[PDB]
Amino acid sequence: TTFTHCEIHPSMILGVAASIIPFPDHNQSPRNTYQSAMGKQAMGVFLTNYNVRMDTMANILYYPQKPLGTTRAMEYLKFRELPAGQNAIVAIACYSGY
Amino acid sequence: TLSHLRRTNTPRQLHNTHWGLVCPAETPEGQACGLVKNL
Amino acid sequence: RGNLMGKRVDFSARTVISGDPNLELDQVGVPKSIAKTLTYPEVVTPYNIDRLTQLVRNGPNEHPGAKYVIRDSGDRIDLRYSKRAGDIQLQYGWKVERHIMDNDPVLFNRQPSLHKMSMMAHRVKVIPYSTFRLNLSVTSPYNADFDGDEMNLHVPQSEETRAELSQLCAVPLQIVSPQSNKPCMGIVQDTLCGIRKLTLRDTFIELDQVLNMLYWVPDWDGVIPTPAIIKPKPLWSGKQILSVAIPNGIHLQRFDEGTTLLSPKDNGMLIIDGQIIFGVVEKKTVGSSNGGLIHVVTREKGPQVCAKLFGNIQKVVNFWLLHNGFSTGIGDTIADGPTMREITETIAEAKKKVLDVTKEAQANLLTAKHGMTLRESFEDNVVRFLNEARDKAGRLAEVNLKDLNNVKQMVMAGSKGSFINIAQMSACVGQQSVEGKRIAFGFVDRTLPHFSKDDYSPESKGFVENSYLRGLTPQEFFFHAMGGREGLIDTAVKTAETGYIQRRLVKALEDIMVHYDNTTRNSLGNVIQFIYGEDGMDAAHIEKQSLDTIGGSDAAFEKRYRVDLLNTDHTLDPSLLESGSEILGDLKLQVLLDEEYKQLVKDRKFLREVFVDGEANWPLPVNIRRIIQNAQQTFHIDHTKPSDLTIKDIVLGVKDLQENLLVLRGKNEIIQNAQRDAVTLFCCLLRSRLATRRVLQEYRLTKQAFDWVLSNIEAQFLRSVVHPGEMVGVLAAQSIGEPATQMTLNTFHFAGVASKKVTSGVPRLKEILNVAKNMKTPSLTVY
Amino acid sequence: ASRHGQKGTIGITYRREDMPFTAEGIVPDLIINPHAIPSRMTVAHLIECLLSKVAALSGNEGDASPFTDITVEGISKLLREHGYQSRGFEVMYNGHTGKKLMAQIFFGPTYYQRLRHMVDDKIHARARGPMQVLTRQPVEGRSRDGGLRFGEMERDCMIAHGAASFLKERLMEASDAFRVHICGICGLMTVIAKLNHNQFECKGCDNKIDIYQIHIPYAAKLLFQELMAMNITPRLYTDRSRDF
Amino acid sequence: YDRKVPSPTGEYVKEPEWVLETDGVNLSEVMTVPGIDPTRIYTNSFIDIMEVLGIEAGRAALYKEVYNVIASDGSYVNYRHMALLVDVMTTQGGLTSVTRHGFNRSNTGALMRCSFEETVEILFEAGASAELDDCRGVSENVILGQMAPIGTGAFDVMIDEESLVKYM
Amino acid sequence: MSEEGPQVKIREASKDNVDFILSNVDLAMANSLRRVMIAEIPTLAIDSVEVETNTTVLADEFIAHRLGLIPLQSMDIEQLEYSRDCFCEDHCDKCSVVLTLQAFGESESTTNVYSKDLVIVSNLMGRNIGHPIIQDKEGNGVLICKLRKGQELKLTCVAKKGIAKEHAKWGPAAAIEFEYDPWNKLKHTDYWYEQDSAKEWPQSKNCEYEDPPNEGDPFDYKAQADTFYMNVESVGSIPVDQVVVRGIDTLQKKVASILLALTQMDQDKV
Amino acid sequence: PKDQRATTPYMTKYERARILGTRALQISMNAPVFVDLEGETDPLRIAMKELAEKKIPLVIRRYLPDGSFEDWSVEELIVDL
Amino acid sequence: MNAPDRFELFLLGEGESKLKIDPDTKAPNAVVITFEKEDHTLGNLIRAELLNDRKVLFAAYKVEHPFFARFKLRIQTTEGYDPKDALKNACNSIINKLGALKTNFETEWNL
Amino acid sequence: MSNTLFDDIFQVSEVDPGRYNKVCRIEAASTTQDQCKLTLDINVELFPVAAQDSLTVTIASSLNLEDTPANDSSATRSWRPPQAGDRSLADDYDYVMYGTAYKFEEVSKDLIAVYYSFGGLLMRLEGNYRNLNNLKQENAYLLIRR
Amino acid sequence: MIVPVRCFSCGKVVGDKWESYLNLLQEDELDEGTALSRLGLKRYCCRRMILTHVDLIEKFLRYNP
RNA sequence: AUCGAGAGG
Ligand SMILES: [Mg+2]
Ligand SMILES: [Zn+2]
Ligand SMILES: [Zn+2]
Ligand SMILES: [Zn+2]
Question: Does the beta carbon of D102 lie under 8 angstroms from any beta carbon of chain A?
Fold first, then answer.
């Protein structure tokens, strides 16, 4: 009953890469870290004018898609504006064994 | 790119006082792990 | 260290690996582009000139082509700059640097190379695409995965080196590791899981499904087995079809907790003559365990047959699983209502207990434990309560999971997963910890700015009440992140530390070898061990066996080993022998029986002195028990008929075997004495295993079967003896260095009777190998 | 890789005709192994999928923001309202036979990221090529047609295997090999090998007769010469005088 | 602590006994304490158990502790490998470490010693002391491309005169 | 299998849909038919693009890729020579269809380039093929790309004959629904459940076409799979009924070809 | 010495490996084969046949720690393994 | 890079006949037939119909590896019933049923 | 077909589907021969059972093919599909299983027990004191009349 | 960057629905879910092709070359 | 050619 301040929103403790993870608090810690590294490795549109600038090694997805499930942080990181991946349909199952 | 712009290279554990100031999850794997932190 | 001890080499390749269940254990899928690139200087002879001239005609643009041709003059003909593909006539003695062909022997490995198993020879299979393809089961020794791992090829150039690899480094030959005295390869991932499901009691297979499964087995003899059920429907059990993969003559009996040879649980394991008889097949049976199928087959049939076993089982099971299916999802992590209520009650109860103690500690009523302070006594007791709570909650969830639960099934099979994984996903994640402690007060008298000062209530110091399913709350999340951080750190540090340690051991023992005198020596010729391993035998041929005479009461021993033809108390039942009525009262045979028994009594005395803890299970060469079973089956030992064995023949037969075991072959008393000592335990095993009653009542063998057993034991024993030239130095160094990489304990997480604040894991290993004068934890045990 | 630190590579690709399918004719784009879950405990990965399906069916954006009041039960309720199994399991058929699979499959939309690192820019193989001028030893680097390093650990294992002739081949025949003449009197590489008149002469020992040829790795030659550079002799003898 | 004790029946029966686990080591005095069984006292110090009892006791204890470390995580390594290690570390009558002050301080071939840690610091000594390297070790033949003794190179395949005749 | 089998019943039908009840057939055939419709029916599609002018945002091959996915009238595809069997060099009107695309940002506003803007140049010889399939109620068949005022695009396309096994671009099936044993009577699947599978699993729409199983019934182990519910779609290049008929024809030809092979060997045998 | 050979009478896996390798090499060098080539063209397979029939014309010099040695012929050695 | 040609999924190559019939040695009246450039889209039909023939003792198939469009078929029959002819009969049977399928669909469609 | 190793009638005292959806553990006792109890795992899904049911249980050993005695086709030689059920065949039972043998456990000499097993489904028959016909030979066809 | 011609998972042409899709959202002001339904996009494996599409080409055309 | 940085395993 002596509170002096209040967090604007718990999720703000996360950084850029961490904030694009779905339900971070339902993963084992190390996995969120691993994703933080993976996010940096993803392909996608970097700069809108990438066609103008000449550079060494650009990796542009043909058809970038929004994350069907997003975090509110993406509103400020403009991830929806410049996403990096696709909404693939997946099946978690043992099949041919490959 | 944003991960560079918010990058803080220390010259290695998640100290309690990091709460809210640097990201708990974001860190390099091995070597500089725990030393390079992101805001 | 840079250019001499290690160096860059030609005739090599590197790329990403991917799994391929349709390859044989000892095969490797090599991309056409690599097969085209790398070459081999095959010599032109009267037995291959036909093929080689065709390869020249094919040119250097085919995955069955060739490149440079070497003349006797030493000239190298570059086929990329030649219009004489069909004009060049090869002469005998020339060489043709052809492309890599199927079944070529190549050396294949993964970095870092921690042990022999990381370097194995495979048979090349030229494939499309651009990854190396591997049989799932070979990744276990490589320590490989398919998340982007890369492997190296080293291609032999001389005929001598091809032979050397194919006869020494071939995968099949590495199935049983000398490191831990067990198999290092086995059935894992999907196949392992699939097998469990396949061999379940309720698994029955339709006719046409069976026809395909049988066809998949490469070694199927074309004989369709009669179905378990013949009337209403011709159905085959999963056990029946799987057993087709297993070779004839194989016997195995594990026998688990509640196994009764009829248990409704279908636990344990019984295999007779290659036929699966009883028990669900799981990790314990077809895993890397040395008490399982993989080991037995390797020993009984050999490396070549066992390699086929891997292929046979995988092809059948993977096919069956393909047409069955196996998945997993969120529902598998969800416990029902009642269960979750009990979980929250368990957590709440523990919290109450922690609170009660907290109050007592605050009230200065809590008494310090011996050997520690009051404050840490409190800390200790609280952690204990919270750990117990986590586990109890986990068990509540576990117990109430249905057999349908896919996660549960993977855990039951033993293919990825464990109790704690279920417990954390479905129930309490548990108390987080940093450096073996609860979350420390990084702020003044508190862990976060969200708590008041001086508050030790479970959750304030890292206790997580929620499951991964339920989700962690901000504070729990952060505390969890802190625990995760130190974990990540340790996984980095330990590779630097164990990498160094491993190298030091290998270098230290680099030149330790078994010489032709059977003595272990270094470069200087200094004797390390007069007899390698204090027995002179190869670890790869050692199996854990039971020394029956060590245990049991003296009375029980007498009942099982004393024979007295002069007194009815221990006289053999006449019906045991064809002449069992003639031996009655035969003092001369009684003398031999007295000799035998006397020795067996001495054996108890001796072994009681050697193994004071009473342990009867020890690693000894030659699984005699299994040998006996082979005789019982091979000769159709009818246990209702009197045998033609003679007591004299049994006693002297066994004694003769002992004399013909050999290890050393010198004539000097020094060597002869060493020989007598070298085989003491094995002889104790022989005597305890092949006693008169054991041979006549328990193992009612015929003279033919009995003689066969003795000659069989001899042959196998000789095979178990270590070969000269063996690099036991490096081998031991790798054997000790490798598994050290699994020590993530550091100082705790091993438990004991006293306050175990004892340095362990890698930290302790370093103290030992460095011979530190100031160890962190001295401790003296006084009795 | 997914958004949950779940990496992987494409083991094999199948045409739609050969892959599992739902009653509705929906065929997976990417099949993930069940064994990749239970040990990693990436529950969020599973949740994202469930939520994503609801989002696709309802035609809106899902909210996976960390610390909210969104629960699995809420999500599953919505899914059941769309006529699908509440926990995301769907009955699928075997693409090969068309027979209904015995186990139902957790199936739905998710989000994967194509990562940098492609086998086409990693695969490497070379048989003879550019060697470093210093040590005459295959150069370093995939892009420069370099060789692969047979490291200390790799030769250690060959020793453990007992592959003595293999090491000789890989350490000398597969790179670094040099014929050098050694003076029998003083085991130094000072012989003037006049390989055209068969004249030798040690000079300093005046040995024009008792010399021998050694097949040795060029790098080892450099070692010995670099020792000579420090006024230290490494006298190589071909006749063991110290019998025992 | 519990311990199996061969009962009067001949069969081992688990019995309990009081054991005093102390913090610190001082065998020189503890062993003489009245009421204590001086033959069962066991420490963690190799140096102290060696100095008090001897190199064989030290070596035996060395094994036991190596064993404990490996066994502490539930893993298993064959006795034969662990025995070899501790035997090598105690061939000199003391405790030889695996460091440059243990392994490198030996009488073995100079071309092998220098491959571990110290390099010219060893080669300079070899030069000044006119050390002769017998070249029958491993590294000695690695560092010059010869078929080192070991495995297929531990013997020499040849046709002698007797067998030549027998092979015709 | 002797003619008195496949009883085809149609529940619903439209230009791009045929809802089937195929009873009295072998499951293997029901599936084989499903599979052959998916990937062994020949269609017409752009398989080569010549880029003359491209000052647009999109990459040359990016556009070429998109063009190959545009569905072309393939009604008379059987009258078009399969390119692999065409002895005529490169290509010709007998085995290919040539289309061109010309666009320029005449307006200052974004100019849209549509598949409707493709123009057939080669001689169709009266064969009903090549015409870009337009099912857009606005007439604007598939958007190829957007175009800025000062930009220009000029392409020449060559469409060929092929099947989905070669590339997904050739498929016409789109999607095929397939289900049998609405009510789990054959026990081909064991429903996963956390309480009551009868309530947890959604009842299939096909269940209304078969009487519910009784709890007093014994497992009818003699029963076989039969009565397959299917719904074949179409991308528009081939009338949905032709997708099915031609799929069936394909299987007949496939079996006939191995039958022929058997005959050929017997002819070559003594 | 000829007699009193203290080393094993069995052929070791290392001896076998090198014997086959060196013999196979000779075969690949177009040396005369002492067994019937029953469709055998692979030097190694050919060598293994000779090993089985003890036709391989080789002697193993087993060096002992002190520099001495024992000569054993292929025919004398017991090719079990 | 080193990806295979998609034409190899259905077009016969050089020296590749459509069928190759080998005789089994593990059992009497049994053969193994190799189908080139042909997966179980067709293969599964063949097995299914073979198992409807009461004179066939064994009928099964397998695709040894998915990288290659090849199909192994094993057929065992009773004495006198040459497995080759058994297959020929299965083909005739399948075609006849397909003919009816087409006819019934076309009629149902028209109506 | 040609012979019988055992022939008696049992009444089911208990049925236990220990976490099984098809197979139940049957505990039955022989009528008349009160020294002979029978334990049996049976595919209930395929062949329905109930407590207190009286079943006729035999073992036999005649390889039940098609013509007069133990024809090899069932044991040793590829098993032939049905069709020949229209020939000499002991198919007048409502359930048939082909099994094997473990060991003739001897219980308290006067008491009785015998070997057993059907591809994973187990049994335990306390067959009469003699069991002389009931040979160790694994060939066995548990025949049950409903 | 323009809408994928054909659904990745089906081959169902959705490259002619984008324009009208936006109209349903703007001119008609419908919920995205109902708009997708109005387009005939029954299967969620096709709905996602439009639902999560990012029209970047409009941004690219803002540059003058 | 060295030198540092970013990563991958
Ligand atoms: Mg990996
Ligand atoms: Zn000189
Ligand atoms: Zn043409
Ligand atoms: Zn779709």
Answer: no
